[PDB]
Ligand binder design. Structure first.
Ligand SMILES: Cn1c(N)nc2c(ncn2[C@@H]2O[C@H](CO)[C@@H](O)[C@H]2O)c1=O
Ligand SMILES: Cn1c(N)nc2c(ncn2[C@@H]2O[C@H](CO)[C@@H](O)[C@H]2O)c1=O
Ligand SMILES: [Zn+2]
Ligand SMILES: [Zn+2]
Lengths: 157, 157
């Protein structure tokens, strides 16, 4: 189930790259085992540098549920959330985060060195409380492979 | 002119709390002394926990200028930006940040203990690049007073 939803976030990353919507990033929000939102990076579609996949998923899931907190849902991210997205995950009060690729995989292919301390556990003023799971095995290999497979198929941002 | 745009952000904070749009926060984005966007927190109005003042202003300024980078623009925040909003400001490529009140001023009236390590220089992984100015003098006084004056008018969300 973790694997099913992480793979769907990865698939969203591929879809969004193929549509020219944005970069190779997807995110899926589920309530128990029911998909609430499934999104990819929309920075180029919306002309909106905040429209990362996680932020997009959070906005859509709060709209679908008519409330500004998601304490009963979990989020699956094809890549390690950046500082903006991890902050949005804190404010959204999602109860769990599962992510596939380490940020280093995205950095290696042209993106910024832009890593969230609170996620890695080196925050001082920003302390996370949500449960965090870095995928291993096949999930990790799938997520890491996204950046090799899409290496020169999208405009950087 | 720093004072002018900062007090415009303070007035946006008051306006939004009075319309019920969200909490007492405002942000103004400016391009060579021309105001590109003037917004306040819209979390309640939009049912969106990411719709802080700064993020909302970044969305609007980018839509207006037809680009995803505001490298020639500056942002005035009535209150010190939270981790999400500092992440957004970095992603937007804004040239300069000027903020009024320290985050403790918001926390004193019940807001989340939620401070951006990269803004205060306390991170291991996330470093900041942009010019940052904490206002002082009469601007800082008016900005800090917003939360004590506001207390009555909105319910913390
Ligand atoms: C969803 N999503 C995520 N998760 N990350 C992105 C995105 N766009 C650029 N990035 C970069 O990825 C690194 C962070 O890991 C940083 O360089 C960020 O700038 C994006 O849409
Ligand atoms: C614009 N804006 C800002 N700047 N901060 C906000 C907002 N809504 C809640 N907060 C809280 O303020 C502290 C951060 O300084 C944290 O407690 C945050 O949760 C908001 O819309
Ligand atoms: Zn992000
Ligand atoms: Zn914020």
């Amino acid at each position: 189930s973790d694997h099913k939803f992480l793979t769907q976030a990865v698939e969203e990353a591929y879809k969004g790259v193929d549509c020219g919507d944005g970069g190779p990033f997807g995110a899926v929000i589920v309530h128990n085992n029911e998909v609430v939102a499934s999104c990819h990076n929309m920075v180029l579609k919306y002309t909106d540098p905040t429209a990362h996949a996680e932020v997009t998923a959070i906005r859509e899931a709060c709209k679908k549920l008519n409330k500004i907190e998601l304490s009963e849902c979990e989020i699956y991210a094809s890549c390690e959330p950046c500082p903006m997205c991890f902050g949005a995950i804190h404010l959204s009060r999602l109860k769990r985060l599962v992510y596939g690729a380490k940020a280093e995989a995205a950095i290696a292919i042209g993106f910024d060195d832009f890593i969230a301390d609170a996620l890695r556990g080196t925050g001082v003023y920003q302390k996370s409380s949500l449960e965090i799971k870095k995928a291993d095995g096949n999930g990790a290999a799938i997520a890491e492979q996204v950046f090799q497979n899409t290496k020169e198929k999208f405009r950087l941002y």
